[PDB]
């Protein structure tokens, strides 16, 4: 419900390690083939990180419905970044149960894409104003995830990271490790001139 966000800027980005780490249950990319994205220049990158169940990992995708994609973290239908998710059952749990991660279950209206709401105000499951205090048919809209090492696959914690690039006009700051040779002038060449490949 409070999915964290970080800005990636002014660096060389080696996606070969992430793609060939082979320890990822899900690595799917929208708007760019995963293999070729390494050889491409992005203006800015936003890496957004959080944790979810199993059955909800399918739900991190544009045009998806349900609790995560309607009340917690909504992906725009015109997405350009791409989704990484791997099992972290052994790290995020403990015997007896882990109750640190929350998730939102009751919201009046769906989330616009990339909108984060961290309020703690009571939900109106009933009709009478319960006045910001818990009462009959006024539940709490942050239900807790519970994680024990013994749970089934469907309830294990998947650590998820959304790598939302923006492929666009702006001066690229994050892209792959080319040699970046010197130019030639007045004789027509075929350049990969900052990703604007052409002759």
């Amino acid at each position, epitope marked *: 419900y409070a999915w964290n966000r970080k800005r990636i800027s002014n660096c060389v980005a080696d996606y070969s390690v992430l793609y060939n780490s082979a320890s990822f249950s899900t690595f799917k990319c929208y708007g760019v083939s995963p293999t070729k994205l390494n050889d491409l220049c992005f203006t800015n990158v936003y890496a957004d990180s959080f944790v979810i169940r199993g059955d909800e990992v399918r739900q991190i995708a544009p045009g998806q419905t349900g609790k995560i994609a309607d009340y917690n973290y909504k992906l725009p239908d015109d997405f350009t970044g791409c989704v990484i998710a791997w099992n972290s059952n052994n790290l995020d749990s403990k015997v*007896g*149960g882990n*109750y640190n991660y929350l998730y939102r279950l009751f919201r009046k209206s769906n989330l616009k894409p990339f909108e984060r709401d961290i309020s703690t105000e009571i939900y109106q499951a009933g009709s009478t104003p319960c006045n910001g205090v*818990e*009462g*009959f*048919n*006024c*539940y*709490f809209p942050l*239900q*807790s*995830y*519970g994680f*024990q090492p*013994t*749970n*089934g696959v469907g*309830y294990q914690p998947y650590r998820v990271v959304v790598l939302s690039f923006e492929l666009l006009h702006a001066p690229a700051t994050v892209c792959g490790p080319k040699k970046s040779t010197n130019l030639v002038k007045n004789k027509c060449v075929n350049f990969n001139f900052n990703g604007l490949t052409g002759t």
Partner: antibody
Amino acid sequence: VQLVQSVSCKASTSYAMNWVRQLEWMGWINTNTGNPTYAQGFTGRFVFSLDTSVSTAYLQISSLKAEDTAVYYCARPQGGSSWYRDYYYGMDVWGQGTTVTV
Amino acid sequence: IQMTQSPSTLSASVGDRVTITCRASQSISSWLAWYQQKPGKAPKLLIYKASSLESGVPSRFSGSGSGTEFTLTISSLQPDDFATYYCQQYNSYPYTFGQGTKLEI
């Protein structure tokens, strides 16, 4: 709103959870967080280790004693499942009750 | 805290009004509930807040009083209501029960 008594009470976390015996009070396990405080004589002697995704409030009776023979009820309070405020919301519905013999 | 109900065991005819009073060791301040348990089943709600009836409970059970002292009344005694009845408290942290009342026919 049916409570299944089998030791663990399978629910059936909109509301919290509560436990009692026969008639005293076991000490109000919270389901939305880690286990908070208990009854006066029921803190260290009786533990719950609730497990979710089936929402069963586990019981482990520590240092099992001769006169523990009793009928244990899991009871679902009226409302209020939140974190670290200690409602005055005791009991709404009940189940069949597990019969322990010692 | 401790709950003292004046009735302990009482019986009468069907169609009768029964009165039960329950007090506590100090000012409980309308934080009280009234329960009844039929034999061989876990107890059930009849009054919360010491003054409001439950979902689907018959209207003949009315709770009145204030401060420390509260009272349940049955307008038309029913033989199914033959059962034990318990007055518990909400103000003090330990929700304790009492010696209860028995109602027969």
